[PDB]
Each structure stands twice: as structure tokens, then as C-alpha cells.
């Protein structure tokens, strides 16, 4: 128990999902077919863990900022943790809203130890399905610091594309939910995310009539500032 986050709270916590599917024409970005499947899957798989999940669809940049700022201003005293899942287009360091781009760091900053007191010493988890660049992976034949207690689970490594199958959803979300459903009530979060890394790496490969984007691979990227083990027990 000394090496694990205390989970003896009334609620596991809030899980906010920002599901951006449709974008203003001025952004030049296309519809994210498959993302509703991700949002539906995540609602189910995170609820199974014990989270109180709320979904917001097609948010403007101002709305994303307002949502997360307001969430950070709620009283989390009776919650063990907080989670946020961002589903959108992205480039390095930013995520698209319906009307533009917002730096990811500015969205997460609301939950810093000096800004969200009732989440102090509790895990703050961010899962991000978005591109981080335009590189393809061709594959190869087989007091406390204010930034403590954050974990970022990125769908892909910095500088790389992130993949989504239109009738199935993003590879990262598919893998994430399947592992959480199978093992989420048993394994530690890093054990879970490591299995997600392997699943994305091994069970997916891109299909396209466009040669440039055919037979490509993906590996996710977990950034942890956690100070204890996290079990959803």
C-alpha cells in the first residue's frame, strides 16, 4: 500500500472524453471517420473500470479549454484520480479543436499540483489519440513538484503519424480498450500500457490503395511522472 496510490475513495474519478470528429472547413482537416466508435468503446471500457465518463463532441478550442479548466475547478476530494482522453487531429505538441489548434500542455496545465489542489498526490491520466508529425514507421521483419503524478499515454511517438481505421476506430483506442477489458481490474497501469504498446505494434498494419501509406506500423509512447503504482482495484 505504501507503493501504490490510495484507491480508498468514494469515486474512482471523472473521465472526460473530447471526441472531435467534424472540423471547420478553414482548418483544412477532414472528418475523422471511426472516432465515434472509439468514443463509444472508451465510454464502455473506462466505465467498467469505475470512472464517471462524460463525452463532449466537436469542441472548439475555447470549449476544450473551458471544459478542462472547469473540470480542474471541481472538488475532487472524494475521487482517487482523474482521466482525460483527447481524440482529434494533431501535430507535434498540439491538438485540433473544431476551429484551430491548442497546445496540449496548456490543456493539461489546469491539473498541476499548484492549480488543482484536490488532485494533489493523485494520478492525472491523459490519453491522446492524434498525430504528432508526418513520419511513417515502415517497420522491420519480426511539498511535491507541480508536474508530479501525471501520465501521458500517447498513441504514437513524437514526430510520427497515428492511425485510424474508418469502420473500426483508432488502433490505439482499440488496443487500449481490449487490454483494459481483459486486464484492467488486475494489472498496474504501466503493465496495461506496455501490453497496449505490444498490441498496437504487433496486431495492426496499415491498409491503403495509396502506396505511400500502405503496410505501415505504429508504436505508442507512455510518458510517466507517476510516483506510485496505480491499480484500478
Amino acid at each position: 500500500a505504501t507503493y501504490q496510490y490510495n484507491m480508498n475513495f468514494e469515486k474512482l474519478g471523472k473521465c472526460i472524453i473530447i471526441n472531435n470528429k467534424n472540423f471547420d472547413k478553414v482548418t483544412g482537416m477532414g472528418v475523422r471517420n471511426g472516432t465515434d466508435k472509439d468514443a463509444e468503446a472508451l465510454f464502455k471500457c473506462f466505465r467498467s473500470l469505475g470512472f464517471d465518463v462524460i463525452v463532449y463532441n466537436d469542441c472548439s478550442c475555447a470549449k476544450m479549454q473551458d471544459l478542462l479548466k472547469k473540470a480542474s475547478e471541481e472538488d475532487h476530494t472524494n475521487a482517487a484520480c482523474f482521466a482525460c482522453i483527447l481524440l482529434s487531429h494533431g501535430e507535434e505538441n498540439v491538438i485540433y479543436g473544431k476551429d484551430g489548434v491548442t497546445p496540449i500542455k496548456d490543456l493539461t496545465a489546469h491539473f498541476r499540483g499548484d492549480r488543482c489542489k484536490t488532485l494533489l498526490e493523485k494520478p492525472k491520466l491523459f490519453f491522446i489519440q492524434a498525430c504528432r508529425g508526418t513520419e511513417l514507421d515502415d517497420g522491420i521483419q519480426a511539498k511535491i513538484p507541480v508536474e508530479a503524478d501525471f501520465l501521458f499515454a500517447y498513441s504514437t511517438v513524437p514526430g510520427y503519424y497515428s492511425w485510424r481505421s474508418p469502420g473500426r476506430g483508432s488502433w490505439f483506442v482499440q488496443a487500449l480498450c481490449s487490454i483494459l477489458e481483459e486486464h484492467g481490474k488486475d494489472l498496474e497501469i504501466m503493465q496495461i500500457l506496455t501490453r497496449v504498446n505490444d498490441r498496437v505494434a504487433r496486431h495492426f498494419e496499415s491498409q491503403s490503395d495509396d502506396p505511400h501509406f500502405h503496410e505501415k506500423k505504429q508504436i505508442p509512447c507512455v510518458v510517466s511522472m507517476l510516483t506510485k503504482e496505480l491499480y484500478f482495484s
Partner: peptide
């Protein structure tokens, strides 16, 4: 498949 598509990219984000």
C-alpha cells in the same frame, strides 16, 4: 486506413 486514415491518419490523425
Amino acid at each position: 486506413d486514415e491518419v490523425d
